Amino acid sequence: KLVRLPGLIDVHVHLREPGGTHKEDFASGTAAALAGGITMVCAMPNTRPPIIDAPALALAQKLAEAGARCDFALFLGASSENAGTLGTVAGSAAGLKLYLNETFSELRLDSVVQWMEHFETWPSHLPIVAHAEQQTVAAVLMVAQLTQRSVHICHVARKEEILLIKAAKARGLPVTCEVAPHHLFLSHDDLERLGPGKGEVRPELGSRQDVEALWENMAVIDCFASDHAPHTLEEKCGSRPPPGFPGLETMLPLLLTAVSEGRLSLDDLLQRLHHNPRRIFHLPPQEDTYVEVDLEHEWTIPSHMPFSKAHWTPFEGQKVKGTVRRVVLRGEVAYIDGQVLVPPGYGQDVRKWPQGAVPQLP
Amino acid sequence: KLVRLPGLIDVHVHLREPGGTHKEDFASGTAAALAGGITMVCAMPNTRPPIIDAPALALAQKLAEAGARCDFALFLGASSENAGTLGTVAGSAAGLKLYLNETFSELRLDSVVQWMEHFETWPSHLPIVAHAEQQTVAAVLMVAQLTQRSVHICHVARKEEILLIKAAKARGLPVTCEVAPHHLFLSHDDLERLGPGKGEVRPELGSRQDVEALWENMAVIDCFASDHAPHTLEEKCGSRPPPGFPGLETMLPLLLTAVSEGRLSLDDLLQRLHHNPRRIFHLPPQEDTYVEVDLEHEWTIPSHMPFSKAHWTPFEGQKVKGTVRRVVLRGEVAYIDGQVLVPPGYGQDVRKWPQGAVPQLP
Ligand SMILES: NC(=O)N[C@@H](CC(=O)O)C(=O)O
Ligand SMILES: NC(=O)N[C@@H](CC(=O)O)C(=O)O
Ligand SMILES: [Zn+2]
Ligand SMILES: [Zn+2]
Ligand SMILES: [Zn+2]
Ligand SMILES: [Zn+2]
Ligand SMILES: [Zn+2]
Numbered sequence: 001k002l003v004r005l006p007g008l009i010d011v012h013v014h015l016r017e018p019g020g021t022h023k024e025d026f027a028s029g030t031a032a033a034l035a036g037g038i039t040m041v042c043a044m045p046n047t048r049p050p051i052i053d054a055p056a057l058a059l060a061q062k063l064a065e066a067g068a069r070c071d072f073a074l075f076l077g078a079s080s081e082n083a084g085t086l087g088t089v090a091g092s093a094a095g096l097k098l099y100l101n102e103t104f105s106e107l108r109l110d111s112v113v114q115w116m117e118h119f120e121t122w123p124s125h126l127p128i129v130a131h132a133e134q135q136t137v138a139a140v141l142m143v144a145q146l147t148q149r150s151v152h153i154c155h156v157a158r159k160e161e162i163l164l165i166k167a168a169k170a171r172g173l174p175v176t177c178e179v180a181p182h183h184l185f186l187s188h189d190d191l192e193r194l195g196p197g198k199g200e201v202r203p204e205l206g207s208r209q210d211v212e213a214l215w216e217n218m219a220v221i222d223c224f225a226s227d228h229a230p231h232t233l234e235e236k237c238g239s240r241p242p243p244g245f246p247g248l249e250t251m252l253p254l255l256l257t258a259v260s261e262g263r264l265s266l267d268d269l270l271q272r273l274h275h276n277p278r279r280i281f282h283l284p285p286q287e288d289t290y291v292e293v294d295l296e297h298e299w300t301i302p303s304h305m306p307f308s309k310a311h312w313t314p315f316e317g318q319k320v321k322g323t324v325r326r327v328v329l330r331g332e333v334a335y336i337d338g339q340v341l342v343p344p345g346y347g348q349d350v351r352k353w354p355q356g357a358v359p360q361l362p
Numbered sequence: 363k364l365v366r367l368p369g370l371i372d373v374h375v376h377l378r379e380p381g382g383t384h385k386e387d388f389a390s391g392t393a394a395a396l397a398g399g400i401t402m403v404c405a406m407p408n409t410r411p412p413i414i415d416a417p418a419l420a421l422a423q424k425l426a427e428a429g430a431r432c433d434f435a436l437f438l439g440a441s442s443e444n445a446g447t448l449g450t451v452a453g454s455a456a457g458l459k460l461y462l463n464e465t466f467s468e469l470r471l472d473s474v475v476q477w478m479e480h481f482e483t484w485p486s487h488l489p490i491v492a493h494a495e496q497q498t499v500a501a502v503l504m505v506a507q508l509t510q511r512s513v514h515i516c517h518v519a520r521k522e523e524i525l526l527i528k529a530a531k532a533r534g535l536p537v538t539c540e541v542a543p544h545h546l547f548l549s550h551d552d553l554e555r556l557g558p559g560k561g562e563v564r565p566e567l568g569s570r571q572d573v574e575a576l577w578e579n580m581a582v583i584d585c586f587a588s589d590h591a592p593h594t595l596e597e598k599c600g601s602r603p604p605p606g607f608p609g610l611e612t613m614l615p616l617l618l619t620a621v622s623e624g625r626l627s628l629d630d631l632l633q634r635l636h637h638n639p640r641r642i643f644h645l646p647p648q649e650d651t652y653v654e655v656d657l658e659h660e661w662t663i664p665s666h667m668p669f670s671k672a673h674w675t676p677f678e679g680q681k682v683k684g685t686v687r688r689v690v691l692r693g694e695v696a697y698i699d700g701q702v703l704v705p706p707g708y709g710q711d712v713r714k715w716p717q718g719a720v721p722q723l724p
């Protein structure tokens with residue numbers, strides 16, 4: 001007996017095209033998404049060139065329209081030079097992305113004044129998301145209050161961060177957040193197995209107490225999102241390993257295992273991979289779209305999943321219970337038992353759909 | 363013709379006793395204060411032992427009462443273990459001091475949750491001051507708002523920081539700040555002369571644009587305070603130089619030079635070295651206390667000032683116009699033309715004066 005789920009949404013993926021296509025491209029990354037039960041992705045702007053201006057966005061839009069197998073929206077990235085310049089294209093993007101700490105990113109800002117300028121100039125009705133770790137979460141929340149608008153915090157990984165967000169929500173502040181599967185299912189304890197290169201990720205893997213705090217505070221977590229961040233094994237195992245884990249193909253199996261163990265409910269999962277992503281990012285429904293999963297099948301995660309060009313996974317060896325059997329996207333079979341059945345270019349930019357425009361006052 | 367000023371107050375000094383008395387002690391540091399026209403100092407808690415518990419405060423109180431030549435109040439320091447334990451002694455301190463970044467300090471906190479705990483437990487009517495640089499200013503402001511109280515930001519040094527504080531004040535938030543003379547009168551341009559050891563200070567010396575921004579935004583600066591941070595030349599010139607500059611003996615001459623040049627008024631100076639320190643820290647008046655200065659006398663700062671045990675100064679070679687001629691403290695001549703005339707132990711803990719207790723609701 002299969003369970004039918006709606007089309008799941010991953011609001012934080014790195015698809016590497018343009019400019020990093022040996023790591024992933026739209027075609028391979030969206031195949032990975034479909035195999036993970038994900039029918040819509042929001043792609044981050046830290047590509048080469050980075051998506052920080054209208055010409056770069058135009059290029060990325062066409063590459064995505066030609067290569068994507070599932071539907072998508074593309075983030076713009078904040079830079080030290082582009083505040084006040086994105087108004088004409090802002091509504092065509094998933095949202096604006098701010099990189100506020102050291103990570104794999106033309107995009108670190110050098111002053112909180114630059115954060116303020118973005119919060120003041122980006123249209124008030126459109127999403128802003130931040131890579132903001134530890135005290136940076138409190139700092140960006142302050143900027144959001146000074147400019148009287150909301151913010152969404154990416155990949156929350158620490159007890160400190162989730163408790164700060166919890167306190168902010170208790171004061172009625174407009175903040176939402178997401179958590180990635182590696183911060184729920186891996187910890188410092190796994191660094192011995194992973195090694196120092198493979199284990200590199202931002203935010204870094206947390207302590208057992210960090211992981212426990214995220215689970216205990218599930219009510220504070222609005223979304224799950226993979227932060228799918230593919231790099232090849234050669235890069236991860238080399239002399240200056242880039243941070244990041246691939247995750248599209250493993251996220252849903254890990255979370256379904258947790259559902260089966262009673263750690264959260266199926267509804268809790270669907271709020272975090274469907275309803276809350278829709279409402280925070282104003283993403284449209286996908287007609288005749290659904291995912292069928294098998295909750296009984298036990299398997300062990302292999303050394304690499306079939307689709308991502310990363311060709312490795314930090315979850316190797318973990319036992320999971322839960323499998324994606326079939327995905328239907330807009331009336332076409334997109335995935336069955338390991339076979340992707342829609343071509344590159346089947347996917348569409350949801351921000352171009354009438355129902356995908358973000359409503360605003362005249 | 364001498365100008366009579368009220369007794370000036372320095373709310374940020376490091377007097378090194380207990381435990382660092384080769385760098386400074388209460389007797390030498392308060393001699394330096396008097397020679398700088400300062401009749402009351404607030405001493406920071408990053409001593410050895412640090413002033414983070416009742417027994418350490420009791421020790422420091424007696425050492426100060428025995429050694430100080432001018433009046434004083436002593437800060438308590440926040441630690442990772444003392445939130446909720448300081449209630450009985452809090453009112454006897456200048457305030458609570460939080461070290462939120464790397465500097466010469468049992469006192470860095472490891473989580474914003476620890477900041478919140480201090481803001482929640484320290485009595486609401488008593489001062490909290492923070493060493494908070496760059497984005498940390500925004501972060502601690504967020505904590506202050508979440509806990510609905512004020513905060514004072516120590517040694518503001520950057521355009522970024524003063525503009526953030528300016529924005530917060532424009533939104534009516536209860537934040538005050540101070541600026542140290544080295545951040546008004548030295549910059550990156552001086553590092554060639556100072557060298558990498560002597561030049562070490564936290565916050566670091568800023569760019570010419572940082573210095574210009576502080577002057578342009580003088581209206582945002584509530585207090586001047588030296589951050590007198592004495593270390594010996596051997597330490598500053600050695601293999602792991604500690605950060606900090608001595609400053610009590612040079613602060614007023616530097617600022618009087620600026621007054622003479624029309625960069626700020628005498629009133630602007632007295633607001634920042636007398637009235638605002640009094641009102642932010644609830645410090646009492648000192649009866650029959652005043653300072654006589656000579657605004658005409660030009661001199662060049664020597665390689666060391668007479669009193670501080672630091673026995674060096676980063677302002678060596680600067681030309682100043684303005685000299686402290688005489689200081690009277692509580693009816694006794696305390697300083698004349700280079701001679702301190704009150705003994706160690708003349709100074710008193712102002713928090714023990716009836717008028718020095720901070721008013722609170724029953
Ligand atoms: N998280 C990572 O470790 N890496 C991400 C960047 C990011 O989400 O910050 C990447 O693009 O490789
Ligand atoms: N500012 C410094 O560079 N040093 C101060 C510490 C401080 O005020 O942070 C010290 O105590 O030496
Ligand atoms: Zn990130
Ligand atoms: Zn995100
Ligand atoms: Zn990311
Ligand atoms: Zn909407
Ligand atoms: Zn400091």
Ligand SMILES: [Zn+2]
Pocket residue numbers: 373374491515516517540587
């Ligand atoms: Zn201070």
Ligand SMILES: [Zn+2]
Pocket residue numbers: 374375376406589591
């Ligand atoms: Zn200090």
Ligand SMILES: [Zn+2]
Pocket residue numbers: 641643644645720721
């Ligand atoms: Zn008062």
